[PDB]
Design a protein around this ligand. Structure first.
Ligand SMILES: Nc1ncnc2c1ncn2[C@@H]1O[C@H](COP(=O)(O)OP(=O)(O)OP(=O)(O)O)[C@@H](O)[C@H]1O
Ligand SMILES: Nc1ncnc2c1ncn2[C@@H]1O[C@H](COP(=O)(O)OP(=O)(O)OP(=O)(O)O)[C@@H](O)[C@H]1O
Ligand SMILES: Nc1ncnc2c1ncn2[C@@H]1O[C@H](COP(=O)(O)OP(=O)(O)OP(=O)(O)O)[C@@H](O)[C@H]1O
Ligand SMILES: [Ca+2]
Ligand SMILES: [Ca+2]
Ligand SMILES: [Ca+2]
Ligand SMILES: [Ca+2]
Ligand SMILES: [Ca+2]
Ligand SMILES: [Ca+2]
Lengths: 319, 319, 311
DNA sequence: TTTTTTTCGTGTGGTACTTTTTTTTT
DNA sequence: CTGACGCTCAACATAGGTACCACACGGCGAGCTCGATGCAC
DNA sequence: GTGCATCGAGCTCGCGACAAACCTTCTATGTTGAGCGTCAG
């Protein structure tokens, strides 16, 4: 795991300065090393002279230079992929949800965005040989649609004890975009103490659709949303967790899409399209089945797979 | 219940600022705690320095951090589900209408959207052991179709006093979309003084269909509708009432039958589909019987049940 | 009845502002209070500052807050139900046509939609003890099928004076959908000066069926029809008149359903389905209602208007 | 006393119509 | 050593049929309309 | 005292793109062509 920020006192950093950093949301050496000099300057009691010393010492403990692609290829052979509960999705994702990267699932209502998040909150606790991340799950909810009954249904499927599954899911409810971002600061502190394997934000952009309304507030909305996605990327790099965010859709009311029966695109604009490394486009299928399409990915070919929402969470289409 | 906003002044907030907050529609500590910093700044005489202090004190009285899913599972085991008067619907909903969430019922004319709302306006006054919410009902009407004679019919079925039932229903008629939203501010003030168990908006989207006409006003329509649904969600979280809204349908005039799509869909677009946690799709049966289908839900399997609109409200089909 | 809009300027509104409202179709305080802020802003010369003040002043004169269902139940015990001239129809409607709501009658040709509208245009002038609304009737005709000779036949049945009955019916003929909506603005002005108990639009959707032809004009048709039904609803709330509209039918080729789509089905609080029976008898069926069970009654079109079947 | 610098950000679904065609003696 | 014939899959195309629809910021300044104040017999 | 004239106040409507960029083909049933196994000689 990441090195706790207490290691800086061994490099001559004053314990008072270390405590100032923790109040600023830095709990690991990696978090300090990745932070720009501007962020440390903004912290009261951290002058520019102190900031240079802190960054220099942190860079000693964290490798931040060039390296061969051969070494990097070796590490990526060891990153954990979390099973989605469906063989077809795992074939589509070539293993499952990938840790250390931001994955976005979007689609219209009832398409299963919350159902997949509930499945992942349990499958991430399985041992690695069974397709899990072997760690606790963190669930940040913005819609109020977190249902522990669904988690117990999934835990029944894999033979896990439901009581222990619930204890390993940290749940927080976000009521506004400011609270949604503030929860991440507590998330970083929690992830230092115990090993978390998955972070779920559902829905990531639900609150931005109403806190910032109108074209007048669009620039402030995207700027605030972009800062939120940077913190998610920081947590993914710092702790190696898998970040799964859920997105909504907006209809295109132009006549350009004649060949599409109901054209719609995810909200968030270009800020969230670039930030997400993997985007899954869920849509309604026949009955209880749904279709997942690789909308964006650095390494996955654009393809479709069909899954179903069963009583015991997300699974393959039985019929 | 929620803590009154007067608790803030015990933490050092000026009583004049509290009065300014109440004039802006915040009547409980939860309403202030859930408010983003933007909303408090908009209120005249609330500086940013005041806004930060007000939010800081509110967060001390309201838990807004992470918690175990075990504790959240414990809390949800105590929420109230209000019976719909029909055995089949209660089985379909696994108990009845759930408090603390937005439930949307839609369907074409005559399908029984208003009849269910009339039954719920009475059943919610039953004691909890009989399937009620043991609270008063609030009925916001946007069509003029509120008939107290129907309430008296349902009250006779359950043996309740007709005069007592009518006194425990608060009725307001909304004449436009602006008035419909403004009634929610009065709703929060009323819900602080007396225990309300159910809030009915019927119909939630009837007035939006004509106040904003054409694609030119579509964006302003959905933005206004989205703000209305946020206030409904805020009331559900703040007071724990069940919010039941009613929606209309619009025909699909493309090759929906060619692609096997349904010929009619609810209005409101993606703004109302995402916001509603549970959506019920009522359709006409034979005679007085109707069919209710779970259109969207976080925990309910997509199924159907048959109910009837009897002389004494919504009930089970007698044939 | 409704308070004249001239009461606003006694509350601090400039006289010129009230003039602009009247030219925009607002003639009572209720009409202004019920209007959204958008409608007032669209009036040239009225800014968002004026609109906020006007709406604030109107809300003082018009109650628009929450109230007990007991109080509302008390008011609905005093609404007037206009007799349809038929014992069976009145039993089916539990009193007759209800004021303050939009009632829609549809059916194929010859079913008696216009005959009922002719009977209602007379019975609405009866004293309340005899089942009337004790007010004048307004008849907006879009088909050209208004026949004053039918009114005289109905008036003779109840003993009313034939000349007096015809003087209490305001008749207008609509030649297109734009004109049909525009007549409602003139209707609001007339209803302030005199007590009307019934407004009839026959037929409401007849002109929409041809002014907007094809799927290419369907959205424009339904948007225009929706605004027409909102204006009718505004009149029903503002003046407490019974609004009776008449609708046509279309065959389902997937056996006949009313035209207008979902816009008119949701808007209409009560819908009556009329169909042909033996001889001159007809059958009326409650197709939609918030409080009336779906039942059927049989009436007849006699020489003296709609009445009970003689079978 | 001198001396300007710098773009950012997408959102929003609506809306039903139209009937047609007779056949076969014991 | 081989060909005629039926089964199933893999790929492919059309289905009662029909089609249109627009706005929305951040803001200063002409502009020009009328009330409130001042002026000519 | 009557008719006339002016300034403050109000509310209304512009102002700008470089004239392309868009790529989406749907669900579901039955059809069309081909790959393949059977059986007899
Ligand atoms: N126990 C269950 N068994 C089967 N299906 C279920 C069960 N619980 C929920 N579902 C289905 O899950 C579907 C998707 O619900 P979900 O909460 O995942 O939607 P969503 O994509 O988050 O939508 P929204 O935008 O409204 O939040 C629903 O249509 C419902 O039918
Ligand atoms: N007392 C009663 N007994 C039996 N059926 C009744 C009774 N009152 C009303 N109904 C029936 O209830 C049905 C549904 O009416 P309701 O007001 O619920 O419609 P709705 O879904 O709100 O429609 P709309 O879209 O017009 O608002 C009507 O068709 C009517 O036949
Ligand atoms: N004086 C009368 N005595 C008896 N029956 C009459 C009399 N006048 C008209 N009728 C009957 O009224 C019936 C229905 O006419 P009405 O004008 O009500 O039709 P409608 O429903 O408006 O039809 P449409 O769709 O053509 O407008 C006719 O079939 C006619 O026989
Ligand atoms: Ca969800
Ligand atoms: Ca991307
Ligand atoms: Ca209704
Ligand atoms: Ca939803
Ligand atoms: Ca007629
Ligand atoms: Ca209706």
């Amino acid at each position: 795991g990441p090195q706790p920020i207490s290691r800086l006192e061994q490099c001559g950093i004053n314990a008072n300065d270390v405590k100032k950093l923790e109040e600023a949301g830095f709990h690991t050496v990696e978090a300090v090393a990745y932070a720009p000099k501007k962020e440390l300057i903004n912290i009261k009691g951290i002058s520019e002279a102190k900031a240079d010393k802190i960054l220099a010492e942190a860079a000693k403990l964290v490798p931040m230079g060039f390296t061969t692609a051969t070494e990097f290829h070796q590490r990526r052979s060891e990153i954990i992929q979390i099973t989605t509960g469906s063989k077809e999705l795992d074939k589509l994702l070539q293993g499952g949800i990938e840790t250390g990267s931001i994955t976005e699932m979007f689609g219209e209502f009832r398409t299963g965005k919350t159902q997949i998040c509930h499945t992942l909150a349990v499958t991430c606790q399985l041992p690695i040989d069974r397709g899990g991340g072997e760690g606790k799950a963190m669930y940040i909810d913005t819609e109020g649609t977190f249902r522990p009954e669904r988690l117990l249904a999934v835990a029944e499927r894999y033979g896990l004890s439901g009581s222990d599954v619930l204890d390993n899911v940290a749940y927080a409810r976000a009521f506004n975009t400011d609270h949604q971002t503030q929860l991440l600061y507590q998330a970083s502190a929690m992830m230092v103490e115990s090993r978390y394997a998955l972070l779920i934000v559902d829905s990531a952009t639900a609150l931005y659709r109403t806190d910032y309304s109108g074209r007048g507030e669009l620039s402030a909305r995207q700027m605030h949303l972009a800062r939120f996605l940077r913190m998610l990327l920081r947590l993914a790099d710092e702790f190696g967790v898998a970040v799964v965010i859920t997105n909504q859709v907006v209809a295109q009311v132009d006549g350009a899409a004649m060949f599409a029966a109901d054209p719609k695109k995810p909200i968030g604009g270009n800020i969230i399209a670039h930030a997400s490394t993997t985007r899954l486009y869920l849509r309604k299928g026949r009955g209880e089945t749904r279709i997942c399409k690789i909308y964006d990915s650095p390494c996955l070919p654009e393809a479709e797979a069909m899954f179903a929402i069963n009583a015991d969470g997300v699974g393959d289409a039985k019929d």
